[PDB]
Amino acid sequence: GVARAVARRGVARAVARR
């Protein structure tokens, strides 16, 4: 229901909820 798409050096997307 809530997934983030951030792929930066230091800030990666560890947010992945349905």
Side-chain angles (χ1 to χ4, degrees):
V2 57
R4 299 304 184 167
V6 188
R8 307 303 173 212
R9 298 188 297 173
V11 187
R13 49 87 66 177
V15 186
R17 297 186 177 173
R18 304 303 174 179

